[PDB]
């Protein structure tokens, strides 16, 4: 009974998301070391200390969806992997959304976005596991609604973590019927 509205990993990086600032913040990457290609948005500016990097989805038409479920899969590297990053490095990132009736296109205005939650890893990836290609994939799900406008965006804010976002799946549950 689920209807999928957005599926980053299945789209092969063709979804055309928006980054702000463009360049040096979140970057679209692929890993092809495994059976299935892996796609991701990732950032790792853990030494600077003044990071405010944003990632916004394409516009998603809501249709009949009222409550939307947002499933994220991601890795976070241990801040202790980076020497002298005690104050600059973080281990969380933030999830936001915005409802709208039109597509704003390339105009990203973070002032229109509402925070859903801080997203934190149950498992951090330490250096030895990173170097051996054994990353720890975390899964976090949140829901919001009822939605009331024609469409919505999700956005992701990085504040100085070493984070790879590998899956973003948004779905709703079809109305229950009495057989």
């Amino acid at each position: 009974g689920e209807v999928v509205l957005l599926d980053f990993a299945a789209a092969g990086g063709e979804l055309g998301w928006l980054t702000h600032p463009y360049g040096k913040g979140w970057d679209l990457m692929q890993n092809i070391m495994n059976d299935m290609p892996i796609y991701m948005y990732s950032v790792c500016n853990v030494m600077s200390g003044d990071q405010d990097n944003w990632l916004r989805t394409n516009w998603v038409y809501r249709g009949e969806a009222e409550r939307i479920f947002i499933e994220l899969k991601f890795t976070v590297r241990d801040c202790n992997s980076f020497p002298g990053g005690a104050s600059s490095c973080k281990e969380t990132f933030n999830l936001y959304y915005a409802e709208s009736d039109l597509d704003y296109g390339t105009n990203f205005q973070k002032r229109l976005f509402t925070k859903i939650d801080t997203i934190a890893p149950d498992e951090i990836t330490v250096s030895s596991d990173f170097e051996a290609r054994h990353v720890k994939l975390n899964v976090e799900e949140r829901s919001v609604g009822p939605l009331t406008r024609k469409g919505f965006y999700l956005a992701f804010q990085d504040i100085g973590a070493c984070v790879a976002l590998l899956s973003v799946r948004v779905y709703y549950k079809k109305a229950h019927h009495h057989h």
Binding site: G13, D27, L28, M29, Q30, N31, I32, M33, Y39, M40, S42, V43, C44, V46, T75, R77, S81, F82, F130, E131, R133, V135, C162, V163, A164, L166
Partner: peptide, 10 residues
């Protein structure tokens, strides 16, 4: 530093 091993820009 990199967030994910063997990742290459698209």
């Amino acid at each position: 530093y990199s967030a994910y091993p063997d990742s290459v820009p698209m």
